[PDB]
Amino acid sequence: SVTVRPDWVTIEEMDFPRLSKLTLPGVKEGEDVLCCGAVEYYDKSYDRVNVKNEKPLQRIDRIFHTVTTTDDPVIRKLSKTEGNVYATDAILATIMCCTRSNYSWDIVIEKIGNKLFFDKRDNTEFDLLTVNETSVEPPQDDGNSLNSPRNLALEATFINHNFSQQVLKSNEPRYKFDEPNPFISEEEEGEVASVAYRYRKWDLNNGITLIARCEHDAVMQGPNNETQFLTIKALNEWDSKLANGVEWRRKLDTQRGAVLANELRNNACKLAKWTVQALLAGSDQLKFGYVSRASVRDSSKHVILETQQYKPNEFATQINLNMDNAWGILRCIIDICMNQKDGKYLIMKDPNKPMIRLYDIPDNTF
C-alpha cells in the first residue's frame, strides 16, 4: 500500500496472535454528538426477491462520499470542543478488524498536542471493497482481466453503490436528521446517496475520548411504526467455478447456511468491517443483498438473487467478532501514539506477514 523509506523509524510492531488477545471490556454504546444528513426508506418489496424471482441490478447515479477525518468539516469543528481522538467508522473498522486482513493497507495518524487524528490517504484503494481476500487462493489474474483483484474490487464497490440505493424508495421524501449532509451544497441534495451520519463519542479509559463519524444507509418502518436504522451491503458472486465457491443459483434456496459460511471464510475482513460499521452506528439491522453476474464472462450486468437481514450484535456473534477485542486493538494503537511527540505516524499491515507496524515518519511525507 505504501513504500517504506530509509528514514522511517519503527516504533512498535505487533503480530496478529497478540493483537487477537488485546481487550478493553465494558465500553459503553456510542453517544450521539451531532446527527446530519437524510436517508430514504427501505423498499420491502426487495424482501420477496429470491432465486426463482431475481431482480436485475440497476445502475444508480449518485454521489458517494468517502471523506477522511481531517477533511470532515464536522470533525474539524467538534475537535475544537469535544474529545481527543478522531476517526471515521471506515477507518476504525480497518484497524479493529486488522487480524482478518490479508491485503496491505495503511492509516496516517497525526498527533497535535493531546489530540490524534486518524486518516486514510485518498489516492489509494482504501475505499474499495475486496473480493475473496481471505480465500486459500485469492484471485490470481494479472491486471487486464475482468477477474483481477483490482477489477473485482471495482466491480464489488460498484455493485454495493447500486444495491444500497436500489432497494430504497428513491421517489419519496427522505427521513431528515437535524443538520444537513455536511459534504454537499443544497443544490446536490437530490444527487447525494441515501446516507445519514451520527458523529458519536466513546470513553475508552486512560483519558481517551473518541469522536468518530458513523452512518446508516437507510431507515425502515419497524414492527409498529418504530423507525429502524439500517446498514445495507451487498455480497457478490463473480464466477463461482473460478472462485471454487458454492453456486448461488443452485444453493441459495435450500443451502443458505452453506452459502453464508463460504462468504464468512472467503470474505472475512470485508464482512467483519461491515459489521463493525453497523455496530458503531447503532444500526438496528444489517441487510445483505446477494448479487451475481448475469453471465460469468461479463462484469457489467448483475442480478439480485436474495436479501437477508441480521441484528448486528447477533451477526457479530455468528462471525466471532468481539468488540472487546476491537476496542482493545484501537486503544493499544492510541497508547503507542500518545506516547510520541507531535507529528505524523503511520500504521500499516505488512504485505506478506500477519503483523502491523507503527512508524515514525517525516512530517512532510504526507
UniProtKB/Swiss-Prot annotation:
Domain of life: Eukaryota
Chief localisation class: cytoplasm
BP terms from Gene Ontology: cap-dependent translational initiation; formation of cytoplasmic translation initiation complex
Protein name as it appears in the record: Eukaryotic translation initiation factor 3 subunit D
Subunit details: Component of the eukaryotic translation initiation factor 3 (eIF-3) complex.
Chain segments carrying region RNA gate: 125-139
Shown residues within the full chain: 172 to 537 of 558
Similarity comment: Belongs to the eIF-3 subunit D family.
Protein role: mRNA cap-binding component of the eukaryotic translation initiation factor 3 (eIF-3) complex, which is involved in protein synthesis of a specialized repertoire of mRNAs and, together with other initiation factors, stimulates binding of mRNA and methionyl-tRNAi to the 40S ribosome. The eIF-3 complex specifically targets and initiates translation of a subset of mRNAs involved in cell proliferation. In the eIF-3 complex, eif3d specifically recognizes and binds the 7-methylguanosine cap of a subset of mRNAs.
Organism: Nasonia vitripennis
